[PDB]
Amino acid sequence: IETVPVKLKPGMDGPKVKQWPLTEEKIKALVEICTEMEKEGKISKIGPENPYNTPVFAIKKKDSTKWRKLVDFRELNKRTQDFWEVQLGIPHPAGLKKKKSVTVLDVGDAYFSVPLDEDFRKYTAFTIPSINNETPGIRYQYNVLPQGWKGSPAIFQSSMTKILEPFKKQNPDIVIYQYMDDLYVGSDLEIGQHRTKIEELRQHLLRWYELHPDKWTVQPIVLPEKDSWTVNDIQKLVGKLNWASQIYPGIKVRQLSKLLRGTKALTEVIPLTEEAELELAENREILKEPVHGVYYDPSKDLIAEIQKQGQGQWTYQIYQEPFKNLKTGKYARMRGAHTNDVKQLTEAVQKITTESIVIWGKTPKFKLPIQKETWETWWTEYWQATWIPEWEFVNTPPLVKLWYQ
Amino acid sequence: MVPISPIETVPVKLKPGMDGPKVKQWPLTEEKIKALVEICTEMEKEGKISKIGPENPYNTPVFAIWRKLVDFRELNKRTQDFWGIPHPAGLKKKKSVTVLDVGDAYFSVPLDEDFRKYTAFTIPSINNETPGIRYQYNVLPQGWKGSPAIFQSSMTKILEPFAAQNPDIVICQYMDDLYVGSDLEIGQHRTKIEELRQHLLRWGLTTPKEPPFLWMGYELHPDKWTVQPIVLPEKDSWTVNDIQKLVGKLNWASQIYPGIKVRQLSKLLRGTKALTEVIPLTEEAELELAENREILKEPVHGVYYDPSKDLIAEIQKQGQGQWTYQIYQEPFKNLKTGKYARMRGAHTNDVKQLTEAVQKITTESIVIWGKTPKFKLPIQKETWETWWTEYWQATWIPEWEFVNTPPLVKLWYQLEKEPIVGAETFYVDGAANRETKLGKAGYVTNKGRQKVVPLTNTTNQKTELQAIYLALQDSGLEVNIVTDSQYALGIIQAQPDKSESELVNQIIEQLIKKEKVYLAWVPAHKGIGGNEQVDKLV
Ligand SMILES: N#C/C=C/c1cc(Cl)cc(Oc2ccc(Cl)cc2OCCn2ccc(=O)[nH]c2=O)c1
């Protein structure tokens, strides 16, 4: 009920960012929604004296036909002062990723109760675009706390603590984490008891996505086990081991490469020498061990790389420094995405970002195996998430692709 | 006197750390002086300006050309920051359309009273024997940074209630003009126009062109639109800037006119920034401009948009990285046309370019009509399927159908996913000496076939490509090739059908003639047999 003063970082003016073209239906949805929010005082129309703009579009969440308003706050978020509080930079609940189940809830409706600092409001300005530039776009600004901004959860942290105080003292074994407009709740309970507890908590929120991180673990580097090896098999194996020797210290390919001596047809079977078998075995033992000196640096950017494996399969690696892997995974999940590559990629990026939020409490910077123009054209169509990560584009095909399959 | 409805001013500030502009006043002729006094007198009578005095340190210069010219340049620098033209093909067909230009646009809108003091200017008196006459603006000045924005927002605010009360008409607001379409009867239409301008008159905005309208380089007729006549200068001696103008005009012409080619004329502009020069045209360029004149020989028109019909885009491959497109609703009647040129790069293929063109058309269409058009593409469904399924990058095209209108986009070669049985295995290698640029490229095979070719003026990458090329030349219709080159593998796995490197082009030509090709990679210097760095290191 009382606004807390907020400024930007030193030497930084508010965001001026071009609004990208929107389809007619999305424009309609945004018009209706923004009119409703205007009548509720959540937003107010502004004049030409506000130079600032932040992009806006419309999405459809899971199991809902209702259009939701999505602001892209990335520029404002990086131009917003780094938020430290009396909480002293609350440490990420590392117990959350170790939980048997984690449920994600959208608490954004709560942010519309708290008013935004009057001076800072001008930086929240956005534009509803018109088709074919036939009329000037409709401009607004947020009176209350906008969803998607990084200052909103920080400001709402005290209130949210005051709200969740009974629940945490009731059943302390339930870990609660908060990121953006999303509230993550860990539990060891049973899915029925889990869902009933979730309804209990959401109604608890009312009067004031099911994830399974236990099923998500880390995966190792495995090598084929064959009775007979061709020249091609051994060539691939040698390549993969030579690559893995960047990750692991003691990988040695010489006795295996020794088998490739002479010029043989690719499909010809080469029997393994005893030394080569021993070498392969030692390599397996080496690959079974974890990686040497791999730590997470909170002061560094997380980097996510994604490879397309075909047939709806995708692989990914989250790391800070090259060949030190904090996380690796394979998204094979098929929902409605069979004929669309970009939709699959978008869902994958969302999942990886989510798991990143759970594990490290922050989103990584993606390197996407897609041309900029394609992605930039289609990504907002398949995007159901309330946040957005940072991304770049790799236009040279990686050789490491089949080394991750 | 019926009071005209008050227009609330827009609060204006200067940039932080700056105080209102102080600049002297240039000497003017007696003529100009008397003229400026004459103008400012009646301007003050109308309430557009007010007389001020020494209490105002701020001054901006003024000339006369009579027409009073006020120079706000320094105030423009000192003023704060304030917050695309409608495409005719997007405009919907309407039974009646009325244009209204507001008279005295900026002067009908009051300036923020606290900002008026900074708008001060001084008329120099005769022979500089008296203090120059002092004035300030009470309204939006001509040439001010914040005039168009404030005026536009004011106009929007005033217009809003009338629009909701008249949903059966449609109003477009551009800058200083209003364009009102309706499907009503001409009588009712004219009536609502009069009602509109009366509604505007309540706030003190004065309104008075008939079709065809000449607007923003366009000719808008009732049932159709086109551009305004394009003037292509005929010169036996051209320049750089002239090619800039030419390419600009051609680009402008290519929206309605199909088949416009700007590439050959554009290639001359690399290494530019010199205003004057004389450059010759290749027969390709000469015939390009000539064919452009042939296309511009007879007029073409676009139609307007009907939301009740599908939006369709069709694409043709024009050759040499050029693509052309038509956006239409019913056959032979185009909403508009356009073109796409390939991006700058070393290697390329048709499918990628087609994809890019599709993205461009999609974005443009979303701007203009607010929707993605259904595509007709010169590519088979199977080709696209094979391509996107086996492509390492993620890629997508919106809903589309095959149209058979050669040249068809096709896949020229496909590498195998597995080694081929019965096919000869060529282990290839190449290497070069950095200092002497002397190198070797060759192969050895499992049947004992070998070759090593010496080469002058070459690099490691070139010999690495050369080796593979040799393997392709000397092998049957089905071949397994083993290489340690990550460069060559990187180029071939990108699947170009064309390259700016002739060696790569020749490799492609070899791949096209092949039935099955399997390209395998191994690490270099691992003691892997058959891969001979020693043959080419000699
Ligand atoms: N100068 C100037 C005008 C410029 C001008 C600029 C714009 Cl952005 C729109 C405009 O006219 C229109 C205004 C409103 C609607 Cl709903 C359709 C229009 O259709 C345009 C199509 N059209 C055009 C002319 C005509 O007679 N009949 C007709 O249906 C006119």
Curated annotation (Swiss-Prot), chain A:
Effect of substituting residue 61 to R: 10-fold decreased sensitivity to ddATP and ddCTP inhibitors
Effect of residue 181 to E: Strongly decreased RNA-directed and DNA-directed DNA polymerase activities. No effect on RNase H activity
Effect on the protein upon substituting residue 239 to A: Complete loss of polymerase activity. 25% loss of RNase H activity
Coiled-coil intervals: none
Organism annotation: Human immunodeficiency virus type 1 group M subtype B (isolate BH10)
Domain Reverse transcriptase: 40-211
Effect of residue 383 to L: Decreased RT p66/p51 heterodimerization
Annotated effect of mutating residue 106 to A: 5- to 12-fold decrease in affinity for dTTP substrates. Strongly decreased RNA-directed and DNA-directed DNA polymerase activities. No effect on RNase H activity. Loss of pyrophosphorolysis (reverse of the polymerase reaction)
Site location (Essential for RT p66/p51 heterodimerization): 378, 391
Variant or mutagenesis effect after changing residue 280 to S: 59% loss of polymerase activity. 8% loss of RNase H activity
Positions bound to Mg(2+) 1: 106, 181-182
Phenotype upon changing residue 185 to M: 27% increase of DNA-directed DNA polymerase activity. 10% loss of RNA-directed DNA polymerase activity
Superkingdom in the source lineage: Viruses
Name used for this protein in its record: p51 RT
Tryptophan repeat motif, short sequence motif: residues: 375-391
Effect of residue 163 to A: 71% loss of DNA-directed DNA polymerase activity. 61% loss of RNA-directed DNA polymerase activity
Protein's gene: gag-pol
Variant or mutagenesis effect after changing residue 183 to I: 29% loss of DNA-directed DNA polymerase activity. 46% loss of RNA-directed DNA polymerase activity
Listed result of changing residue 168 to R: In strain: Isolate PV22
Residue range from the parent sequence: 604 to 1027 of 1447
Effect in UniProt of substituting residue 152 to T: Complete loss of polymerase activity. No loss of RNase H activity
Result, substituting residue 183 to V: 22% loss of DNA-directed DNA polymerase activity. No loss of RNA-directed DNA polymerase activity
Effect of residue 48 to G: 74% loss of polymerase activity. 86% loss of RNase H activity
Outcome following mutation: residue 163 to V: 70% loss of DNA-directed DNA polymerase activity. 64% loss of RNA-directed DNA polymerase activity
